[PDB]
Symmetry: C5
Subunit: 346 residues, 5 copies
């Protein structure tokens, strides 16, 4: 009969004394809050900052006996967020926020329904910029594991406990994809119960596995790394006589790799350890330096020399020919097969 908001005026109003400043089950067991998330947006995973932005629908559920309506004939009584500041709400924060905000476009993006037995479904749209430290040992073939963990800031573990629900604690949007990663379907769910000099607080955290789309880096970095090598090999297929041709083909290619390695770590943090993309472009350096270093041997032995003179110099230009025409493709290919098996096993 009476309008339910008018019903809720006495549901939680000064009549019946719903004090929003006192958790349910006061002085009893803690408040068991089941949580799950829904991921609209995901991406902008900046490694310069080692964070990422997500746009989730945080759903919470707890049981408040003070909210147990009985007269009403249905199961759910939704209510606009205008009085969402009227009921008790758990102080779930994100232990690695690094910035977050509500969405208030045309309305507070909030949801509030209440079952007969006091079950409170509480859902709000959030945009987080979560911090996840990036492990970059094997950079272009890394599997980053960024996390988001939900703690309680004020209430201790003996008054408020979080939990994930079993029926799909983490849903993802239907066509949600990324420009650079693959959000692997397996998603871990484990506790991260904290301790301070103030007490112990509740935590739960879902670990998102991330694997890179190697297609991009395969193009901008590896192929340019690979052309300079083959360009540095036919430089040895140059004319037999040492002329300024090898003078050009040598230093030109080395200068490429010098600039390549510059833009190599362009959008990369200043990590002290050595990653995998650079040792590729390191080995690519010492081969292209082998070219200018090899002609040093040729131009050295050539200026040495004349029967016995030319008979021994060209004998050096020949053994140096039949070796470099296969040695560079020999070690460079054996290096490649070893490099990629090292990273195809992780």
């Amino acid at each position: 009969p009476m309008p339910p908001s008018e019903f809720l005026d006495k549901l939680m109003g000064k009549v019946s004394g719903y004090d929003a400043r006192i958790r349910p089950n006061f002085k009893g067991p803690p408040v068991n809050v089941t949580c799950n998330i829904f991921i609209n947006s995901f991406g902008s995973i900046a490694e310069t900052t080692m964070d990422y932005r997500v746009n989730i629908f945080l759903r919470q559920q707890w049981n408040d006996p003070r909210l147990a309506y009985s007269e009403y004939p249905d199961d759910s009584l939704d209510l606009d967020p205008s009085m969402l500041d009227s009921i008790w709400k758990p102080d779930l924060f994100f232990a690695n926020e690094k910035g977050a905000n509500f969405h208030e476009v045309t309305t507070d993006n909030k949801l509030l329904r209440i079952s007969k037995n006091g079950n409170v479904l509480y859902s709000i749209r959030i945009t987080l910029v979560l911090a996840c430290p990036m492990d970059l040992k094997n950079f272009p073939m890394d599997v980053q594991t960024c996390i988001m963990q939900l703690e309680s800031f004020g209430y201790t573990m003996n008054d408020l406990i979080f939990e994930w629900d079993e029926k799909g604690a983490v849903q993802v949007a239907d066509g949600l994809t990324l420009p650079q990663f693959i959000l692997k379907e397996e998603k871990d769910l484990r506790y991260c119960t904290k301790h301070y000099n103030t007490g112990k607080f509740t935590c739960i955290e879902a670990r998102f596995h991330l694997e890179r789309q190697m297609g991009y880096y395969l193009i901008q970095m590896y192929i340019p790394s690979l052309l300079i090598v083959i360009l540095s090999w036919v430089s040895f297929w140059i004319n037999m006589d040492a002329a300024p041709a090898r003078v050009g083909l040598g230093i030109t290619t080395v200068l490429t790799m010098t600039t390549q390695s510059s833009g190599s770590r362009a959008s990369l943090p200043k990590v002290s350890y050595v990653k995998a993309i650079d040792i590729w472009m390191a080995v690519c350096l010492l081969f292209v330096f082998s070219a200018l270093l090899e002609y040093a041997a040729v131009n050295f032995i050539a200026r040495q020399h004349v029967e016995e003179m030319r008979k021994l110099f060209i004998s050096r230009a020949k053994r140096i020919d039949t070796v470099s025409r296969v040695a560079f493709p020999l070690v460079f290919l054996i290096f490649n097969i070893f490099y990629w098996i090292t990273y195809k096993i992780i």
Copy 2:
């Protein structure tokens, strides 16, 4: 007689009991809300982020019987937004906001008029930064289809339904243009009714087709890609004798394309698949590498050699001349005609 705002004090005030926290037609059919938009601003379509900013006038219309004034002699009773927080308003949010805000310069940019029969026109200026994933298979000749979709966050499909109005659901400003695209006049309008573990919610979405102005990329990228080829052809129109001239004209041009392809994907996301602008600048690579690779053949056969010697070496420098003087323009032009027909058919 009485001032209508003073009339509205009893229109929605505590007299007559207009509770703003209870939707119209409560416990009856859902609230049928017709929507349309008006686009002032449009642009800043960043592909680094794959989003875009728009400045719209969202108009809504629903019928609230509680707002049915009868005494008054006219059709419309506008009212400043100061009491726009006084009436019920649907919680239309944008399912792909990624940031949005109201405009509050000198007044809340809001509009509110009410017909005799309870029709509520509600219009507000909004600045959205909407997320649209970019498909970049054929990059400079792509037709991106960015969308904006209007969902309800709290009310389920059985209590609130959105709809587009038939009489021009999407107007565009008179001289609205873009720096890079053409907002095609055809604009699609279809439902995107959602489902969650909470229920099903209303959605409507308008698909904006976008086609690129190819004029820019035709200049900064293609012509510089095209000069290096012709510069790499008259390099073969060099003197007959193999001199360091071809030493210069070869590696110089190849270094251009190396730097060209660097700035090629300058403002482009790190997409794993291969787009169309790069295979252009890829084929431009393997021709300019053909130049330095061709002189490798010339300088190789030249150092081989003398009656029978010169009689067979210059016979190779001639067949290599009459072929390269037409072969590069042969395959390069046939490539061009094939490339552009592949992209003039989409």
Copy 3:
């Protein structure tokens, strides 16, 4: 006697019934609002965004008969903005805001005085970031005309009309200058009365003419464009015999222009049409390519050749000398005189 704020407690308070939610002259003629602006800041005209930031003092004046004090012995009764939310205020917004904000440092930067006959002077400091589409046909010699237009968002043309005042509708700060433009003193003032599917609304807009300081671009772009040409001419003043000197002076200069044109459109939007700065740096390309193309002719005819042989080859190296020693300065200067007259007439 009584304090005038205490006087204004009954001026607009619940006594005498000043309802701030009802415009003056209700049900009568529209409210004639005269406006003018004062420009403190102006600049940051970003062409990457095609907008600009301004810091104005928007003065408004309308007549409200409800504000007609009679007892008081003076003309003006100022009042701090603390009760500036107490009176009626027109909802003037900026039709091309693209971001704007009030200034609230140590006080709301607001002004409010009221004449005896109800005249309301209302002035507030605003920082706008206004959108003006840039026309870049003739880029370094363009005259951009950015605008700012003042519309009413809620009230229709039959209830509220804006106007500029005749006595200097737009003042500019005394020493206000720009880093790149000259704010021409002539400032246009014309209506932009709008129409929608909701009605017709009031508008007024002041067109600011802007002309560029060509001094900067004359230095960073044109001179470097001009040195490469003269460097590409004395390259032909090289030794008579074709040596690797022309091998160097040719490709070196062309590589400059390639990088010049890269940084040419560095801070420029991706406009499809062709502007004027590039056709300059385009013509500068085809002359420097003429150098490497000319030596192609020299090195070609030289390798052709010997009495009749040298007697006809050097006859070609001579006619090619007396022509290129004046032809490049011939066409290049005639091009310059034509280019600058094309742009000195607009």
Copy 4:
């Protein structure tokens, strides 16, 4: 006895009628407000924007007879900013704000004490981003004079007047330094009384003198400008015979200066006039172009030529030797001594 805040409940409360909306000395002389500042932070002087950020403690002092407590036995009655919105406060704004904000971390950073005779000390932490137009005639040796000026926005000069106090109107933090400038101890204090079509308003402004640390620019710009010159001089100490060595040493150095001047005005606004750093790097251009221009003379006269032939050509290669071996160090050093005295006198 009674708690002084409870004392201030009747100090300014509805008892005794302290109306915060009415300035002291109403209808009498204007309110004489003495001001001074204290500078915590200072820096981020961006010339791309021509502004700078400061973090000051604005102290104000005015006398309000309505605040004259008599019963109390002490001189000062501080009070937390919670009731700082309760008293009258002057509307001091900053005429060149360009952005400013309060600091609200753990409390509004505000101070409020009141002497017996009504003296109000009012102090608040502010972070300003003030606009100062930069004069860049002599760029690396410029003395910028940025200002900050304190106006009143609402009250006219006949109702409110600002003043600096004599006892150290501008204090600076003890170890406050800058990365690029030296905040000279002399700080000017003069009025900037304004006039509009609304009246005349109070102003005071303190002029901060700033002088650059020339040490940085002496390293990144001048030394690289200076190495290319000496590298372009020993290029003339090359072998007597004109070989491709001068072919290399000439164009290589000129290309450096071309890229040097690119990054010269890297972080510099697009000012039309010519500054001092560029004419340095301009004169450095025309000397390095003299090198490639000089070898043009050598390679020209060399190809001219043979008894009388070589007897006159080498006579030109000798007079060109004994001159260039001292002429470049002659004019270049005389240029340096003239350049630096032009800028050591300002």
Copy 5:
């Protein structure tokens, strides 16, 4: 019995007269406030700005006799931050904020418990962007000491005093690390009691020592600095006869160092003094300039010359050979051993 929030309605409410605007121990000794922090986030130490962002849990403790509950049977009475604006709170600000904000995601991240004897534990999550001037004498091997200092803004030293607690005044997160530094465990704690023309205020500050991960700079900067040297040494292992080979290997390497030093101070403020990374890359300059300077000697003495002629020129090419083949590795290695011991002792 009664709900404690309802108990706190009379704990601090208008009954019993808890005036939040009056510090504890009024007119007595100052309020002794013990503080400690807990560091979640730490990093983004930008030297371009010379600041850094931290995410701390500021815990405060003071004793307020007015908050002494006696009836209740326990030690602690937590309470949600909804009434955290109800009690007195010290106005601790950060003397070098440069920007800071609260975290309000799903609740104000705040904590409030009260012991029986009035002890108030008050803890709030804060994100600071603190200013620390960077000392960059020895840049890649520097030990920066950034600070954060906690002052009181309003209350003087005779009414409010801060202190650190002895039991671990500064805790750090368990796995908190940085991308570039090592937060040394030793953390200093000393007073910074201030003085102004208003009085003396309380301060405490914790000095965080920071030492760099030299691993990154060891790779991007030093190795490229080191390859050019060895590339500039085997350039002297070139053929005995002076050919254009040394023409290439000389200027090519010098151009590398020119571009190296460009990107050397890429992300570095414009400090006037000379740091350590540049004198490394300065000494690397004058060795690679020694190469092109050395061949100047070779090509000079070579063109001088013929029995006595060649007998004295090659005698110079030999003593120049046996010296440069060890002199560059001689001085360069002795330089290295001296450089690194200068920086391994600090």
